[PDB]
């Protein structure tokens, strides 16, 4: 009566793999015991962070008339959001560039 092998990610209503997070926690040399709800909770947290950055990157691609997310859109999405900017302030994104910012002293006269 092995009913259809119901996965843990579908039980938790997540898209990120719960069992794979459990395997990486068990083999990652963190503790010799791992609870049942910890991979569910960690997969949900990783899914939420991925969804937030992907939504802002899709918005950044939409404002640049693009239908395909490039690293520049990810860099703009990370740096223009201040909570993500202080989450990944010590993080380099390759082929991302910088925010367009000119100091007001360097602006000309009028």
């Amino acid at each position: 009566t092995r009913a259809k092998a119901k996965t843990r990610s579908s039980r938790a209503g997540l898209q990120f793999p719960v069992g794979r997070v459990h395997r990486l926690l068990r083999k990652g040399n963190y503790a010799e015991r791992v609870g049942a709800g910890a991979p569910v909770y960690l997969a949900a947290v990783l899914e939420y962070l991925t969804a937030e950055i992907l939504e802002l990157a899709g918005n950044a691609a939409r404002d640049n008339k693009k239908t395909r997310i490039i690293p520049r859109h990810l860099q703009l999405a990370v740096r223009n959001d201040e909570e993500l900017n202080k989450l990944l302030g010590r993080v380099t994104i390759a082929q991302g560039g910088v925010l367009p910012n000119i100091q007001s002293v360097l602006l000309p006269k009028k």
Partner: protein, 97 residues
């Protein structure tokens, strides 16, 4: 028709902050990486992605250093960056400390 000194620099500032290409040529950077690597040991092979990752690391580090240097120069009531601005920024970051 000659241009005022400063509007061309502002045009390059607005241009190079938009595009994300590497501003250093590939072959001099590969030669510099190999020359720097060969004193630690001889006979070092390099993957292309390793030199590329070193290149974007150098890009990000030096661009952030020139932002801090420009802030130091603006704080000193100047628009021209100087080596004293560079050594001031590195110290407050802790590199010269």
């Amino acid at each position: 028709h000659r241009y005022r000194p400063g509007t061309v620099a502002l045009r390059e500032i607005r241009r190079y902050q938009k595009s994300t290409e590497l501003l250093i040529r590939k072959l001099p950077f590969q030669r510099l990486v190999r020359e720097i690597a060969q004193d630690f040991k001889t006979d070092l092979r390099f993957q292309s992605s390793a030199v590329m990752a070193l290149q974007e690391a150098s890009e990000a580090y030096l661009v952030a250093l020139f932002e801090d240097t420009n802030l130091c120069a603006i704080h000193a009531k100047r628009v021209t960056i100087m080596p004293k601005d560079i050594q001031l920024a590195r110290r407050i970051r802790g590199e010269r400390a």
